[PDB]
Amino acid sequence: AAQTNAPWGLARISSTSPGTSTYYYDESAGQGSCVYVIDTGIEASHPEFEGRAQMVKTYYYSSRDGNGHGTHCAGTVGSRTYGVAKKTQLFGVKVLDDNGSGQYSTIIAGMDFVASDKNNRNCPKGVVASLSLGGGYSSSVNSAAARLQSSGVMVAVAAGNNNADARNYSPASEPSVCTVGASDRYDRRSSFSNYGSVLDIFGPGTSILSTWIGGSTRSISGTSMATPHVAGLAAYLMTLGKTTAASACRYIADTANKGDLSNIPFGTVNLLAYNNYQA
Ligand SMILES: [Ca+2]
Ligand SMILES: [Ca+2]
């Protein structure tokens, strides 16, 4: 299946090379897999989610995404136009308030909620979690991402937008999860992207067009937008029976476009998330 004049990020993850604008992907499109977006929530009622999105848990007055971040990250995961996995189920978990911040205790509850809640959802194809959030190192948060991962959920976390080594950010520094750096359309590492041995993969991160609240659309940059891409890709690859939750990260890193990116620090992996789809 080809989606012409697709956002550059989608087009790129179906491409050996930059500069193309068609997104190629198996028409299965992550159907029957579930991506839990742990973020500010999801405007489920956005025409772009086609009913496939729902808020499953909040730690605040409203499960409504007043911020947008989560709706935008959910969009890049499984929105019809902007999503990688156009047929995946998206499960909003609002750990972040409408100011886009959240206590580490809350976030941890959210990761643990998903580990359990997946046993309450139909995901024959397998479960993904897209942690487009981060902050200072915290072994507690790291352990929570590890647990989620262990629980049989592919976890994709942002490296962080600090242009520093991601060893010093959580859950970015957790070994067991898929730490995602960000690239731009010209295959450069996004200026803001965190790096370091801990990173597993890059994903489109700069000027990522995706769904926004008030049923709208807008481009925003950040490793936070790379992550949904890779989460999405994991949902697409699990539905194709090409990988499992446990090994998805490895499988994405094996099948990635190698050496393509410029401005990658020595000892950071030069791997760009590829769907490795042949039409
Ligand atoms: Ca674009
Ligand atoms: Ca976002």
Q: How far is the centre of ligand 1, averaged over its atoms, from the C-alpha of 213 (Å)?
A: 19
What values do phi and psi take at 178, rounded to 5? -90, 95
Residues, CB-to-ion distance under 5 Å, ligand 2: 69, 72-73, 224
From the CA of 210, the nearest ligand is 2
CA–CA separation, 37 and 95 (whole Å): 10
Classify residue 172 by burial, with Cβ atoms within 10 Å: 0-12, 13-18, 19+.
buried
Question: Scanning the structure block, which residue is given the tokens 């990988």?
Answer: 243
- In order of their start, the domains of the chain are 1-279 (3.40.50.200)
User: Which positions are catalytic?
Assistant: 39, 69, 224
Q: What is the CA radius of gyration of the chain?
A: 16
98 labelled as ligand-binding? no
Query: What kind of experiment solved this structure?
Result: electron diffraction
CA–CA separation, 146 and 153 (whole Å): 10
Task: Give the helix/strand (H/E) hosting 223.
Answer: helix 223-239
What values do phi and psi take at 204, rounded to 5? -50, 125
